[PDB]
Amino acid sequence: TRNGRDSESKRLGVKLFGGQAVKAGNILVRLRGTKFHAGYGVGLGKDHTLFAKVDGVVKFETKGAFGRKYVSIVAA
Amino acid sequence: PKMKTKSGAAKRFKKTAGGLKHKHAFKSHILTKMTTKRKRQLRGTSMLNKSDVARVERSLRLR
Amino acid sequence: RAEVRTSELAKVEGDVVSLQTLKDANLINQHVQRVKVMLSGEVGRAVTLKGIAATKGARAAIEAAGGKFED
Amino acid sequence: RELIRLVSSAGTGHFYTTDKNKRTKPEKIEIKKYDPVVRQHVIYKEAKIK
RNA sequence: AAUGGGUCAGCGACUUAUAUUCAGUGGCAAGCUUAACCGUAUAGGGUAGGCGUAGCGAAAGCGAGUCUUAAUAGGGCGU
RNA sequence: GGCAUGCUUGAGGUUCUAACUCUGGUCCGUAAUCCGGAUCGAGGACAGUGUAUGGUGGGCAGUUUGACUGGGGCGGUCUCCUCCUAAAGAGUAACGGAGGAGUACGAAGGUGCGCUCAGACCGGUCGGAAAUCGGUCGCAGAGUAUAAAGGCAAAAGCGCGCUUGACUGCGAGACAGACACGUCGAGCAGGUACGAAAGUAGGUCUUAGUGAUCCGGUGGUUCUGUAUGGAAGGGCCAUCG
Ligand SMILES: [Mg+2]
Ligand SMILES: [Mg+2]
Ligand SMILES: [Mg+2]
Ligand SMILES: [Mg+2]
Ligand SMILES: [Mg+2]
Ligand SMILES: [Mg+2]
Ligand SMILES: [Mg+2]
Ligand SMILES: [Mg+2]
Ligand SMILES: [Mg+2]
Ligand SMILES: [Mg+2]
Ligand SMILES: [Mg+2]
């Protein structure tokens, strides 16, 4: 009947773009259910949050069947 | 001395030679909700933040 | 409680570091009973600590550098 | 979902704390969990926190 | 076409005391300094007391390390 | 079982006078009938008065009664979740348009092993537009404990067997962010559950399901414990209103 009541905007998005250099446990993408899949050396935590495990450069490559988006980190 | 400190901030803030210690909060009287990852990350004794130093060091009479 | 640095043991007279001897000099307050000695430099001379209890490192300095630790 | 205690088997006063719907399941539970005093797993049983 | 003022001449508004922090300029310097009170009294005595020269810990305690911990494992604080 | 009467004492009843009472009589101080004192009369352990406690008490007093608001009064709204406004990074208002939460679950968790939807259509006894069965066509239009959004074939969906990792001590590094709070987590050490073994497991497809401090309550703990030895009371840990 009356309607205000929004929420407080959880600050999602994609950090660490296509040519960065990452540390051991950085946050790559704050996902909301797998826009991006776990590529070569990344983690996929509890609420589908991609994080690194090794060092290098982010790739953002599209692979395979289903055309899914794979975030791999390359030792380069 | 004509400079009385506040009694509450002398019990909430012990002073060491690396800042001001203080116990963390929210850990009392409803605890079966919370997660063990959250409980043991509130058990320690932290040190005070730089935005809060010059506020407390006027309540404690250190100015 | 109080405590005396090892470097301040040369600041007394008579080479008998009693409890009242440290109150004779101004190195310690009045109404102080239990005193330690910790390692904070070289001792300076040859003394005899008594009535006071040093740490592990201070006792390894005084007994090595020509002193004596009795009671 | 009333809340319950789970006092250890051995003599320690270590316990766990959880909740249990008393309405549907009336009887207790005998869950085997870790004990930080004997440093091994024992079994627990209790209710009635007060 | 909002406020105030008829003009002149007199008076009329960030001070003091006690504590403490930061800068400027000075004294002695791992040490610096006395308060009351004495004094032929702005000298001189008076070092009680304070701040330093070492921390960590709720505490006992131990100390260039110490606390948590089954750990001498990591980590916090410190030189 | 109870009597015999004492030792006592509580509670109830009657009577007596000597305490207290008399805004009763007439003598005295006194030339006054206030106040005393003497003496008859009445009441009498009551009334009355201190102190401790119940009840009644605007008789009286000190005070409280929120904000946003296309004037404020009335009404509506005060916290958290998802979408749109929101301009292809984050963020971003209106008494702008639409909806939900103040919980469930000891398996609806872990693991190993298996397996696919809805719908259409043809045939088939009492059902018939529809129940169960068989068949082809399917190409997720089903399903997800709970709103919508974003997802799901190593299916995050469905079934079976064993189980308690809905573990304790941690945590490099980051994301966010006035602060207090928040979110993800490799790895290490303890002791575990499945699997032949690599390996997986620090709850549930994700995001709502909640409230500081102060006080009190309960379990562990020489850490202190006001001369000493103990205790009370603190302190720390775990956990309740
Ligand atoms: Mg507690
Ligand atoms: Mg002195
Ligand atoms: Mg005028
Ligand atoms: Mg009358
Ligand atoms: Mg009134
Ligand atoms: Mg108003
Ligand atoms: Mg945007
Ligand atoms: Mg833009
Ligand atoms: Mg499920
Ligand atoms: Mg499978
Ligand atoms: Mg005692």
Specify the pairing of strand A37-38 against strand A68-71. parallel
D49 touches chain B (CB under 8 A): no
CATH number at residue D42: 2.20.28.120
- Residue B32 distance to chain D (closest CA, Å): 6
Nearest residue of B to residue D16, measured between CA atoms: B32
Q: How far apart are CA C29 and CA C20, in angstroms?
A: 11
Structure solved using which method? cryo-EM
Q: Which DSSP string corresponds to B1-63?
A: ---PPPTTHHHH-EEETTEEEEE-SS-SS--SSS-HHHHTTSSSEEE--HHHHHHHHHHTT--
Resolution of the structure in the document, Å: 3.3
Q: Hey, which residues does C2 pair with through a beta bridge?
A: C35
Go through A27-53 and write b for each residue having 16 or more CB atoms within 10 A of its CB, e for each that does not.
ebbebeeeebbbbebbebeeebebbbe
CB-CB contact of A37 with A70 (8 Å): yes
B2 touches strand E (CB under 7 A): yes
Establish how many alpha carbons lie within 13 A of residue A68's alpha carbon, considering only the half-sphere containing its beta carbon: 12
**Quick one: which of A67, A74, A71, A69 has its CA closest to A21?**
A74
Contact list in B for residue D34 (CB cut-off 8 A) is none
Yes or no, beta carbons of D3 and B31 under 8 Å apart = no
- Residue B47 distance to chain D (closest CA, Å): 29
Q: How far apart are CA B31 and CA D19, in angstroms?
A: 12
Nucleotides on strand F lying under 7 Å from protein C-beta? 76-86, 89-92, 94-100, 103-107, 149-154, 156, 163-186, 190-192, 202-207, 210-216, 218-221, 237-241
Listed in sequence order, the residues at least 6 apart from C20 whose beta carbon sits closer than 8 Å to its beta carbon are none
The one-character DSSP state at D1 is -
The one-character DSSP state at C49 is E
**Quick one: which of C58, C61, C69 has its CA closest to C4?**
C58
For tokens 């005193």, the residue is C35
The Å distance, Cα C69 to ligand 2 centre, comes to 25
**Nucleotide lying nearest to D3, CA to C1' measure:** F240
**Nucleotide lying nearest to C5, CA to C1' measure:** E53
Q: How many structural domains compose chain D?
A: 1
For tokens 């000695």, the residue is C37
Q: How far apart are CA C12 and CA C27, in angstroms?
A: 9
CB-CB contact of C17 with C48 (8 Å): yes
Give Cα B47 distance to the centre of its chain: 7
Q: How far apart are CA A35 and CA A16, in angstroms?
A: 15
Helix (H) or strand (E) holding A29: strand A27-30
Encoded tokens for D9: 């088997």
All structural domains of chain A, each given as residue ranges with its CATH number in brackets, are 13-74 (2.40.50.100)
CB-CB contact of A53 with A43 (8 Å): yes
Encoded tokens for D14: 């270590």
Contact list in B for residue D3 (CB cut-off 8 A) is 32
Listed in sequence order, the residues at least 6 apart from A71 whose beta carbon sits closer than 8 Å to its beta carbon are A28, A29, A36, A37, A38, A39, A42, A50, A58, A59, A60
Q: How far apart are CA D4 and CA D19, in angstroms?
A: 6
Q: How far apart are CA B36 and CA B40, in angstroms?
A: 6
Which pairs with CB-CB distance under 8 Å and at least 24 residues apart come from D43-49? D43/D9, D44/D6, D44/D7, D44/D8, D44/D9, D44/D15, D44/D16, D45/D6, D45/D7, D45/D9, D46/D4, D46/D5, D46/D6, D46/D7, D46/D15, D47/D4, D47/D5, D47/D20, D48/D4, D48/D5, D49/D3, D49/D4, D49/D5, D49/D17
Q: Could you list the residue range(s) of the whole structural domain that residue D1 is in?
A: 1-50
